Amino acid sequence: MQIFVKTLTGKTITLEVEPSDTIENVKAKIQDKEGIPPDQQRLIFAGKQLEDGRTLSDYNIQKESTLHLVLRLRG
């Protein structure tokens, strides 16, 4: 299935995921597409900070859902 990851810069990343994929896998898929290391990623959905261990279904993340990504800013 598909989900979306919107960065604070406006950019929208599209990912192919399974409901059993963990947040660690999601960060790995964002790393492949955008080169951002998973340590420098924090994902927010439904007013919550997602934990690397739990899966997408754990957070009731269904298809076409939109996650928000927080990055590291070495200004």
Partner: protein, 81 residues
């Protein structure tokens, strides 16, 4: 023969039955189809309204997620400066 004496008493009632039945059949059908039409239209509209409530509730959730992300971004980047 019995239908001959019974004829005068019953023939007018029986010669009009088929029309009386068709009248009641049509009146039943007209009341049911009018009710059904209201049923389908009211059901379809309310289903559309519910799906549009869920759409706006998801959008309200993305806006709050974005502002939470924006606060977390400022907090955690100020810390590790």
């Amino acid at each position: 023969h019995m239908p001959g004496e019974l004829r005068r008493e019953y023939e007018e009632e029986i010669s009009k039955v088929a029309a009386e039945r068709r009248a009641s059949e049509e009146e039943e059908n007209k009341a049911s189809e009018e009710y059904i039409q209201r049923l389908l239209a009211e059901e379809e509209e309310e289903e559309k309204r519910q799906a549009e409530k869920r759409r706006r509730a998801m959008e309200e959730q993305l806006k709050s997620d974005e502002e939470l992300a924006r606060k977390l971004s400022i907090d955690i980047n100020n810390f590790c400066e």
